[PDB]
Design a protein around this ligand. Sequence first.
Ligand SMILES: [N]C1=N[C]=NC2=C1N=[C]N2[C]1O[C]([C]OP([O])(=O)(OP([O])(=O)OP([O])([O])=O)/O=C(\[O])[C]([N+])[C]C2=[C][C]=C3[N]C4=C([C]=[C][C]=[C]4)C(=O)C3=[C]2)[C]([O])[C]1[O]
Ligand SMILES: Nc1ncnc2c1ncn2[C@@H]1O[C@H](COP(=O)(O)OP(=O)(O)OP(=O)(O)O)[C@@H](O)[C@H]1O
Ligand SMILES: [Mg+2]
Ligand SMILES: [Mg+2]
Ligand SMILES: [Mg+2]
Ligand SMILES: [Mg+2]
Ligand SMILES: [Mg+2]
Lengths: 259, 271
Amino acid sequence: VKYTDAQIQRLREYGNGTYEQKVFEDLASRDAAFSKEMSVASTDNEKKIKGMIANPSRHGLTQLMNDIADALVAEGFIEVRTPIFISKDALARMTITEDKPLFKQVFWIDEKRALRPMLAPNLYSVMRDLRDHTDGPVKIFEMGSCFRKEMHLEEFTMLALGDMGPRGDATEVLKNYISVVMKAAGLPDYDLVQTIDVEINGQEVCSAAVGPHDAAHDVHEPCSGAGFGLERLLTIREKYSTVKKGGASISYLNGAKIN
Amino acid sequence: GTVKYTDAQIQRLREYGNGTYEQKVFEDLASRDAAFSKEMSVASTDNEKKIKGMIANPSRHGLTQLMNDIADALVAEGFIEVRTPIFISKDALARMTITEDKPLFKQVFWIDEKRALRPMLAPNLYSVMRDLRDHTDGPVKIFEMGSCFRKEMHLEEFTMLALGDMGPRGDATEVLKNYISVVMKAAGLPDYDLVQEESDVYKETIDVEINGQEVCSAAVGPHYLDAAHDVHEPCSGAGFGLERLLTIREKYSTVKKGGASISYLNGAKIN
Ligand SMILES: [N]C1=N[C]=NC2=C1N=[C]N2[C]1O[C]([C]OP([O])(=O)(OP([O])(=O)OP([O])([O])=O)/O=C(\[O])[C]([N+])[C]C2=[C][C]=C3[N]C4=C([C]=[C][C]=[C]4)C(=O)C3=[C]2)[C]([O])[C]1[O]
Ligand SMILES: Nc1ncnc2c1ncn2[C@@H]1O[C@H](COP(=O)(O)OP(=O)(O)OP(=O)(O)O)[C@@H](O)[C@H]1O
Ligand SMILES: [Mg+2]
Ligand SMILES: [Mg+2]
Ligand SMILES: [Mg+2]
Ligand SMILES: [Mg+2]
Ligand SMILES: [Mg+2]
């Protein structure tokens, strides 16, 4: 026997073990193991919360953001912050129009504005404007909340980075930026898949592309960028049993259930 | 003289300039207009220099840096940093006494019939604080920094720092004043006034004001609000506007330049 579906959900509520691989000889031994792992999960959870209260730390998601950010600034990236609201026109220039599947996932605020589902539209705008002020390449990044109707969260934290202007072996430059982020995140082992996808054990954690060409302009600047889901990265690194425990929450705090 | 820059001229000067244009007086319209022309060119020169410096010396964002400076100070004092969802429920708003007939209710961005963008951090922080009380007999001290939203020194999206301290050791007002001091000093704004102000939600607040400008509202309770969140002990909290703090410290001429933007970056207009 394995743990039942309901037992798996019960174990993952307070526990961060790997429960799905466990196998047993009969119901009696499944049930004995379940009772023991439930008790251990709950007591460990309680001790972890008592530890945060006793010795508070920066939030794990905030820490991950700072670790990546300082690595990117050291690589010459400017940090930007852009609004969570974006325009319908801005989405349509992203090709996210009434027919695209993502469009149905957009949270509208009024007839003309939405919560951003991605950072790219704002980031490309800022990169283009900064390039008006320099002869050299412009490298920027942003970390912030994005929203989609729905490892899926309705609110999730994206890291988006971009590099605009004269490059030189753009694909290798982008792969190096991915390396910088993944190593700074504490996840040095990953797979690149095909535009480039980053996977860990088959789970996508980043999508990146060279030359996402900006209908407003006949002639484009060379551009590269990459978008990472930070709750996914944190979940994988800390081995949390669901993606709902390491990010924003009123039930979980840094992996532990508070209620 | 008595002639000032026109309101339109002030807006034009502040678009790229961070000077103090509202102070200028002139003898006549000709002198006003000649000064305007000169100071518009200064403003755009200074703005371009700031942009070029940012490109030559990439850095963390000013708002992010302020957030880190204050957060590290609060963690050093034993505050837990929490992150909570931007979405909150209509019922959560009602427990704050933000119901259909209140003015703040009119400022809420609704996502659907039952959910809204949070206009304040208190609803989620009350929930987390109360749950953490189940795990300790001592003080419960938490803070969050994050975006709040209100239909509208006012932004529609702004970054609140909110802190809560439940079951403080000592007098709740004295403790609140001390943690306000920790924040303001860590923000680089050690000179400020505390002023009692009226509040629809809190009855009375203690506000932090710098030269008359509110940057924080804080309160002990009141009891009805605490009890609505199942809190039955001395409690206090405070909410700071981080863009307002940064604007005042960096002497930016509007509140739109130091936070999130696709036009401004750290005080400079990029378009
Ligand atoms: N729009 C805008 N923009 C910018 N900024 C801003 C805005 N709004 C606001 N802001 C800021 O924030 C702060 C705070 O807020 P308020 O106060 O509301 O505001 P007002 O008064 O309205 O203002 P004006 O200027 O218009 O006049 O407030 C609030 O929200 C409050 N909530 C704060 C607080 C207090 C207390 C408490 N307690 C507690 C908690 C939690 C838990 C426990 C306890 C909390 O959180 C809290 C909070 C202002 O100042 C500005 O800066
Ligand atoms: N709902 C979500 N919750 C958490 N992370 C997300 C969510 N949507 C996207 N991400 C993260 O943002 C990154 C940006 O990629 P992108 O917008 O192309 O995602 P996607 O193609 O919709 O992903 P998925 O196939 O995993 O749903 C994704 O690699 C993922 O890590
Ligand atoms: Mg998706
Ligand atoms: Mg993808
Ligand atoms: Mg107000
Ligand atoms: Mg006020
Ligand atoms: Mg106030």
